[PDB]
Design a protein around this ligand. Sequence first.
Ligand code: NAG
Ligand code: NAG
Ligand code: NAG
Ligand code: NAG
Ligand code: NAG
Lengths: 99, 49, 238
Amino acid sequence: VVVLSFELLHAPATVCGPKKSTNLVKNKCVNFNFNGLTGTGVLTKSNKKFLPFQQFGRDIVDTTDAVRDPQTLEILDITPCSFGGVSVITPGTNTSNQV
Amino acid sequence: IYQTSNFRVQPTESIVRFPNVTNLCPFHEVFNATRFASVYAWNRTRISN
Amino acid sequence: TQSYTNSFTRGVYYPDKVFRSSVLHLTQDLFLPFFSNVTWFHPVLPFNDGVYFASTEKSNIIRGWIFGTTLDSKTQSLLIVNNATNVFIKVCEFQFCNDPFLDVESESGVYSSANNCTFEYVSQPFLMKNLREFVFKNIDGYFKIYSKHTPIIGRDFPQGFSALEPLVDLPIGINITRFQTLLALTAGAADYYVGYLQPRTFLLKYNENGTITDAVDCALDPLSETKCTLKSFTVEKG
Ligand SMILES: *[C@@H]1O[C@H](CO)[C@@H](O)[C@H](O)[C@H]1NC(C)=O
Ligand SMILES: *[C@@H]1O[C@H](CO)[C@@H](O)[C@H](O)[C@H]1NC(C)=O
Ligand SMILES: *[C@@H]1O[C@H](CO)[C@@H](O)[C@H](O)[C@H]1NC(C)=O
Ligand SMILES: *[C@@H]1O[C@H](CO)[C@@H](O)[C@H](O)[C@H]1NC(C)=O
Ligand SMILES: *[C@@H]1O[C@H](CO)[C@@H](O)[C@H](O)[C@H]1NC(C)=O
C-alpha cells in the first residue's frame, strides 16, 4: 500500500497536472490561447526580429500584434478578422420594395 | 440610406498551444519497487515542483 | 577602502518581455537614479529594495553571494558560485567562517558547514577589463536577476550606455533583508561597486531591431522633465 497525499495548502502549489495542445492553423479566422493569451484573429508568418527572451509584441496603442509560438520558436502576426457597418439603400415603400 | 446594423466574420475553430511538457514527477518507482519494507517502517519522499 | 564616485548613465534593464519597435515607452519602476553616488570598495551591507553590483574583478577574484536573514546555519540563505563549467544556487543554510574567501581545501574557506539542503538550480556559468554588471530584485518571491557582460576596455567606471537582459526568475521567497559578498583565496584589486535602486520614472527608447538604445530620467533637471512631459527626445522653442 502507498499513501499519495495530495496536499494543497497555503504554500504555492507548483505541482499540477499536464496540459495538452492542438495544431496550428494559419490564414484562417480562429480563436487561440498561448499560455493564457486569449483572443481571436488570423495568424500568418512574420518577419520580426524578437530578442530571445521576448514573447509578445505591441504597437503604439498597446494592441498585441505578434506572438512567439511555445513549441516551435517562430513569429506570427495577428490581424483581427473583418468587420464593418451595413447600410440599406431603399426607395420609398410607397414606390417599390427592392433594396 | 439607413445605417442599420453591423457586420462580422465568425471564427472557424479553436487552438491551444501550451509549451512542451517535461519534468514529469517520479511516481513509477514508488509503485514499481517490489518492496515497501514494512508497515511500521515505511518509506516516504516529498514530491514537489 | 571606500572612495565614492558618480554613477553616470548606468544600470538600465529591460522591464518586461514585450517587444516594441521604434517607440518611446514611459515606464514607472525601480531604477538607479542618474548621476548617483556609489561606494567604490577597496563588510556589512543591507538590502532594502535591490542593488547594482558592478564587480569588474578583472581576472576571477570575486565570486559568490550570500542573501538572507541571518546568513548562517539558522535561517534559509542563498549561494551563487560560477567558476568555469557550472553555477549553483543552493537555498539551504550555512554558518559563516571568518572571511568570505574560498579555501581552494574544498569548502571550509568561505563558510563553516552544511545542513538540510533543499531545492537546487544549476546552469551554465554566468560568465561567457572584464566588466560584470548585475541587478538583484526580490518582488513577491520571484527573485529577478539581471546581467550584462562587457569585457570591453573602458575606465575603472567609465560612461556609456548598455541595457541589461533578464537571466532567471527563481521561485523563491526567503527573507532577504541583508546580504554579504564572497571571494576566493586586505589590500587587493577587488574592484567592485554597489548602489541601491529607487522608485522613479524613465523614458526608454527602442529601435526597430528591438533593443533599448537610450533613456532619460524624469527627475534630474527641468529639461529632462520637459522631455518626459512631451514624450520626445527633442524640444522646440517655447
Ligand atoms: C556623494 O556624497 C559625498 C559625501 O558622501 C558628497 O560630498 C558628494 O558631493 C556626493 N556626490 C558625488 C557625485 O560625489
Ligand atoms: C527579515 O530578516 C531581518 C533580519 O535579517 C528582520 O529584521 C526582518 O524582520 C525579517 N523579516 C522581514 C519581512 O524583513
Ligand atoms: C566548479 O565548481 C564545481 C563545484 O565546486 C565543480 O563541480 C566544477 O568542476 C568546477 N568547475 C571546474 C571547471 O572545475
Ligand atoms: C536541518 O533541517 C532538519 C529538518 O528540517 C532538522 O531536523 C535539522 O535539525 C536541521 N539542522 C541540521 C543541522 O540538520
Ligand atoms: C536589427 O537587425 C537588422 C537585420 O539584421 C539590421 O539590419 C539592423 O541594423 C539591426 N538594428 C540595429 C543594429 O540597430
